[PDB]
């Protein structure tokens, strides 16, 4: 992990840092 954060306000970084909508 480089940047320990996430993606869009409706998204998140997965185990691979992929921006997936959370639900």
């Amino acid at each position: 992990e480089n940047f320990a954060a996430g993606c869009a306000t409706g998204y998140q970084r997965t185990a691979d840092g992929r921006c997936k909508p959370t639900f």
Side-chain angles (χ1 to χ4, degrees), residues 3-7 12-13:
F3 63 106
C7 292
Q12 180 175 31
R13 54 168 182 122

Side-chain angles (χ1 to χ4, degrees):
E1 297 176 280
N2 293 335
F3 63 106
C7 292
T9 38
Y11 289 56
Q12 180 175 31
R13 54 168 182 122
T14 56
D16 64 297
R18 192 173 310 208
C19 297
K20 182 198 178 310
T22 54
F23 300 92

